[PDB]
Amino acid sequence: GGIVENVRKRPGMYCGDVGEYGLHHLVYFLLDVAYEEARRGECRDVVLEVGGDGSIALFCTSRTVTAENLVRVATGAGFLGRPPGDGWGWDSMLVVSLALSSRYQVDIWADGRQWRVMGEHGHPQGEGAAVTPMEPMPVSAERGVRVHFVPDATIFEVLAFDRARLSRRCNELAALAPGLRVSFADLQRGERTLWHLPGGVAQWAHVLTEARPQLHPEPVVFDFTWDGLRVQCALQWCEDEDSTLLSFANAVRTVRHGAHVKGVTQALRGALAKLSGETRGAFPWARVAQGLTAIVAVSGPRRQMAFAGPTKELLAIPGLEEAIRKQLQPLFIELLREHPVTPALLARR
């Protein structure tokens, strides 16, 4: 109606397609909402639940969420930056997941009380009603919000979720928002997995390499902020041929990397060049990266995330690459002096 009806009219323009990719995107949009709250230090717990009936529920704890916030965002408030503002799911793709459901239920707990908004065919039914008495919060906290929905069977071509890929996205979210508790509840299996990775992408890099021969017992790690932007990085060398480079901007992957990654690789190639008394060309990235599992994640206000084009596959934030290189190059130099891996890398020229 305005926004919900616009989304329902051309669903693939908003969720990518109406096959298996777009179906899974409805869930990823919810997880992205929880990420943005966690990124801002406003969410400590996230639970994703898949039922046998093809429904999906996400619960998040909070100290700030309100029912008025949810009712507004449910009809499109804040969607695509309009208007600029703040709130749970504000400037998110939440309204797409809701618009493209045949039914939904949203519960908001706050102040010892609970409010519930029902949805049908993408639209909230009125402004909701109290739940009295209050039903138990999935994870007890000052406040919380649950969004439960069923992808609309008249819209989507397939309705079955791949549990494995949803669990993997949850694992990534725990890594990208270190300290965030993220759970995946497979109700059918009577199974629930909890990830809590206080070591972040460093802890994740260890995981990704645990069955490989690691050349050092702890990943090389950095975590710093530049101009409001947090940069987190982990590097782990093993003695094999394969190379892995995963990069993210606000916890969405940048499959063609960009300024965040180039800052790091330029800093490392440059640290090696200096240590060996050689030139950067002596250390091409293809050589340096042999046996490397590296992860580079930048995060910050959504408006500050700028890409080279509409695919959003390549990050391009002016000044970021040089800011990272300047921060990391001297740290890599000192760090690598007495690091187990350096002679081997130095011998790669």
**Domain-wise residue ranges, the chain:** 1-198, 199-349
3-state secondary structure string across the chain: CCHHHHHHHCCHHHHCCCCHHHHHHHHHHHHHHHHHHHHCCCCCEEEEEECCCCCEEEEEEECCCCHHHHHHHHCCCCHHHCCCCCCCCCCCCHHHHHHCEEEEEEEEEECCEEEEEEEECCEECCCCEEECCCCCCCCCCCEEEEEEEEECCCCCCCCCCCHHHHHHHHHHHHHHCCCCEEEEEECCCCEEEEEECCCHHHHHHHHHHCCCCECCCCCEEEEEEECCEEEEEEEEEECCCCCEEEEEECCEECCCCEHHHHHHHHHHHHHHHHHCCCCHHHCCHHHHCCCEEEEEEEECCHHHCCECCCCCCCECCCCHHHHHHHHHHHHHHHHHHCCCCHHHHHCCC
| Topology of domain 199-349, CATH | Ribosomal Protein S5; domain 2 (3.30.230)
Give the integer Cα–Cα distance in Å for 79 and 92. 6
The rounded distance, in Å, linking the Cα atoms of 314 and 299 is 14
Sign of torsion, CA 202 253 38 233? positive
**173 and 125 Cβ atoms separated by less than 8 Å:** no
Experiment used for this model: X-ray
Resolution of the experimental structure, in angstroms: 2.0
Task: Identify which of 46, 311, 335, 313 has the alpha carbon closest to the alpha carbon of residue 171.
Answer: 46
Locate tokens 């300024």: which residue?
259
| Domains 1-198 and 199-349 are alike in CATH topology | no
Place of tokens 């008249």: 154
| CATH class of the 1-198 domain in this structure | alpha beta
Question: One-letter amino acid identity for 195?
Answer: W
